[PDB]
Amino acid sequence: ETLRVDPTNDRLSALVEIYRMMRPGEPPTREAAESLFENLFFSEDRYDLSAVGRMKFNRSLLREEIEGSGILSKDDIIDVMKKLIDIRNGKGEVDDIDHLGNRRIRSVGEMAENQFRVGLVRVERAVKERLSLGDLDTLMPQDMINAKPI
Amino acid sequence: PPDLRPLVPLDGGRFATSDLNDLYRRVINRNNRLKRLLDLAAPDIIVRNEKRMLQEAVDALLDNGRRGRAITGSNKRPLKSLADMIKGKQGRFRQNL
Amino acid sequence: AAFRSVFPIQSYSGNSELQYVSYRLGEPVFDVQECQIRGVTYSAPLRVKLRLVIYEREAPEGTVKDIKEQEVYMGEIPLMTDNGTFVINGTERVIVSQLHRSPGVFFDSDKGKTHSSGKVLYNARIIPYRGSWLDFEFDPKDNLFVRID
Amino acid sequence: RERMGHIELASPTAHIWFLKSLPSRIGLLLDMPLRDIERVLYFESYVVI
Amino acid sequence: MSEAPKKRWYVVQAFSGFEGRVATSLREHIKLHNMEDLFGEVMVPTEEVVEIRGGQRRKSERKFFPGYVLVQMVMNDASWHLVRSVPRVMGFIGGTSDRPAPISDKEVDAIMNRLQQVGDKPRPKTLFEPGEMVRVNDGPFADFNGVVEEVDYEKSRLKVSVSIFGRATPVELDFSQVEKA
DNA sequence: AAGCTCAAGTACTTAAGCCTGGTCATTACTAGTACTGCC
DNA sequence: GGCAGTACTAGTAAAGTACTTGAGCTT
RNA sequence: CAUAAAGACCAGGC
């Protein structure tokens, strides 16, 4: 009944609506509607659930292994929503918010990393253009990288 | 009033003035333009370009923010209007009381 | 662990491969006692080893080369005193650790339906650190919705 | 300080307190739209009811 | 496209003194579409700097319209929406705050003609001395003038009548020494 | 067809004293001009 | 000596209220 | 007698 009130019918109009909700006026292009949704929950440069958060994420779904990637996958959210339906029907109970398996201390070095990854995603866009601004192979010291956005 | 807006320097090459010094200087430069450019004495169906500039000049004395704010270079804050000193759009109503 | 997200860069007609070795800090500015008695900012530059190679496809000129620089200056991060405090401009600084809810999935009671009655509903909320939100809530019409950002 | 001067404006202008306010003083008494026509005529290019 | 596109223009109410790099920032933000898609031409009536020359009197005024950009782009209604999306622009101009009304091209060229029109009547053109009409700039009779009454192309001389002391003084001068009326 | 009220939808709201501390930066990008090096 | 490149420097990019309004239901 | 701006944010007392 969510599908019946769903206006979209395929992958394309879903990406059009996901761009259009993130200013409800227009469809962007062919390419930016893909790149924005890939930069919502499936790319480290805009969405990093850092590598501890995968380990805490696996215990919320009773997974066996604890290692994995930082960004989410297409199999995780469906398995979460199954547990949402199961808690709605009556089986199972709520989870503990304040338990320390969920309530985690973030260290000072990890905070410096989380204030350095902001400059990394800008300086990657710097080295993209300064790959083309280099003459032949002089782009190591300064013609590649800037210390201003970091 | 003349002495209500002084023009003294702060220290060296910097200044501390009111935000009314940038707004009363515009309304007067958008006043005689409709009088003598525009020497007509026309039907009112012709002229557009001046009251779009003069009304734009007096709106910054009226209100900034209800359609379009008035900002300065490297400043994403509206110019402190005469109503904005009373109602405190920038949060200075929490500073007046 | 954050360096290795920006090294594979793939430009069409460039064929660039950037491989990493290690980071080594350079020299500091002064010691731990001149940052209080003086106006020492103590901005230690961060220099990083790099290994890049180029295979250009624009026009064959017959000249190819691989010039390698040992250290390149990127960023100005402060360092740590022998106890564990920082300095940036003039003063001593300590960053407090952060404790909040996990980057995962949760199942609380309800939110949003405090205006109406809001009888039985269950819902999920995810807290990321950067990006957009992702919620999955219900309505009195028994339909599952989504909230992004 | 006490003495005043006045600026002769050739064309008169509006007071936006009487315009963007929801109880429109020139929309209720004088039967125009209270919000719509004010965002149609004043700043824009509709001419000399 | 199946139907031929028809490009139109609009007017962009922005800040005064804040306009030319808003056009440059239209080039910045709306970069990288490999085309010739939507933009036809940008029109910048202001200059990014100012001239030392201003009004002759402080009573005398300007016909300039600072902060009013004119951009060509199809939606139909495009080039005030996506020009306010470039920052330091006051609003959205025309029919309503989401939908401008279209104007013709000749009205746009007339808005350019309001820029091109200058204040050419405080009535001076001098470039002129008591003779009628030339400009001598050499020797004794510099900053004076007259008429070459007898032209000598073979001798390369011009017999110019200088009105000094209220009296004509016909003197023969070179082509490089004078400027022809 | 006119119209009359009703309900959901929407935007907007104002955040219970005063007091000093220290600090921190007041803008970094574009355009024109002037200076210097090379042909 | 003249022209072009570039660097320096001065303008300049939570949980509620009211209130609106769209729609469903009658003379 | 005149000068130390304005504002933001944080910490602190009760």
UniProtKB/Swiss-Prot annotation, chain B:
Practical applications: Co-administration of salinamide and rifampicin or salinamide and myxopyronin suppresses the emergence of resistance to both antibiotics.
Post-translational modification: Acetylated on several lysine residues in the presence of glucose.
Subunit text: The RNAP catalytic core consists of 2 alpha, 1 beta, 1 beta' and 1 omega subunit. When a sigma factor is associated with the core the holoenzyme is formed, which can initiate transcription. The rRNA transcription and antitermination complex (rrnTAC) consists of RNAP, NusA, NusB, NusE (rpsJ), NusG, SubB, ribosomal protein S4, DNA and precursor rRNA; S4 is more flexible than other subunits.
Family (UniProt): Belongs to the RNA polymerase beta' chain family.
Primary role: DNA-dependent RNA polymerase (RNAP) catalyzes the transcription of DNA into RNA using the four ribonucleoside triphosphates as substrates.
Name of the featured protein: DNA-directed RNA polymerase subunit beta'
Organism phylogeny: Bacteria, Pseudomonadati, Pseudomonadota, Gammaproteobacteria, Enterobacterales
Whole-protein residues included: 246 to 342 of 1407
Swiss-Prot record, chain C:
Family per similarity comment: Belongs to the RNA polymerase beta chain family.
Sequence intervals crossing the membrane: none
Record's description of how this protein is used: Co-administration of salinamide and rifampicin or salinamide and myxopyronin suppresses the emergence of resistance to both antibiotics.
Protein name in the entry: DNA-directed RNA polymerase subunit beta
Record PTM text: Acetylated on several lysine residues in the presence of glucose.
Domain of life: Bacteria
Quaternary organization: The RNAP catalytic core consists of 2 alpha, 1 beta, 1 beta' and 1 omega subunit. When a sigma factor is associated with the core the holoenzyme is formed, which can initiate transcription. The rRNA transcription and antitermination complex (rrnTAC) consists of RNAP, NusA, NusB, NusE (rpsJ), NusG, SubB, ribosomal protein S4, DNA and precursor rRNA; S4 is more flexible than other subunits. In pull-down experiments interacts with CedA.
Originating organism: Escherichia coli (strain K12)
Role according to the record: DNA-dependent RNA polymerase (RNAP) catalyzes the transcription of DNA into RNA using the four ribonucleoside triphosphates as substrates.
Curated annotation (Swiss-Prot), chain D:
Secretion signal span: none
Superkingdom per UniProt: Bacteria
Applications (biotechnology): Co-administration of salinamide and rifampicin or salinamide and myxopyronin suppresses the emergence of resistance to both antibiotics.
Free-text description of this protein's post-translational modifications in UniProt: Acetylated on several lysine residues in the presence of glucose.
SUBUNIT field: The RNAP catalytic core consists of 2 alpha, 1 beta, 1 beta' and 1 omega subunit. When a sigma factor is associated with the core the holoenzyme is formed, which can initiate transcription. The rRNA transcription and antitermination complex (rrnTAC) consists of RNAP, NusA, NusB, NusE (rpsJ), NusG, SubB, ribosomal protein S4, DNA and precursor rRNA; S4 is more flexible than other subunits.
UniProt record similarity statement: Belongs to the RNA polymerase beta' chain family.
Protein role: DNA-dependent RNA polymerase (RNAP) catalyzes the transcription of DNA into RNA using the four ribonucleoside triphosphates as substrates.
Protein name according to UniProt: DNA-directed RNA polymerase subunit beta'
Lineage: Bacteria, Pseudomonadati, Pseudomonadota, Gammaproteobacteria, Enterobacterales
Boundaries of the shown chain within the full protein: 99 to 147 of 1407
Curated annotation (Swiss-Prot), chain E:
Pfam families noted in UniProt: KOW (PF00467), NusG (PF02357)
This protein's record includes keyword Metal-binding: no
Keywords carried by this UniProt record: Ribosome biogenesis, Transcription, Transcription antitermination, Transcription regulation, Transcription termination
Domain of life: Bacteria
SUPFAM superfamilies: N-utilization substance G protein NusG, N-terminal domain, Translation proteins SH3-like domain
Chain ranges of the KOW domain: 130-161
GO cellular component labels: cytosol; transcription elongation factor complex
One BP annotation, GO: regulation of DNA-templated transcription elongation
Listed CDD domains: KOW_NusG, NGN_Bact_1
Function: Part of the processive rRNA transcription and antitermination complex (rrnTAC). The complex forms an RNA-chaperone ring around the RNA exit tunnel of RNA polymerase (RNAP). It supports rapid transcription and antitermination of rRNA operons, cotranscriptional rRNA folding, and annealing of distal rRNA regions to allow correct ribosome biogenesis. Participates in transcription elongation, termination and antitermination. In the absence of Rho, increases the rate of transcription elongation by the RNAP, probably by partially suppressing pausing.
Family from the record: Belongs to the NusG family.
Domain notes: The N-terminal domain interacts with RNAP and the C-terminal domain binds either to Rho or to RpsJ (NusE). These domains are separated by a flexible linker.
Name of the protein: Transcription termination/antitermination protein NusG
Phylogenetic lineage: Bacteria, Pseudomonadati, Pseudomonadota, Gammaproteobacteria, Enterobacterales
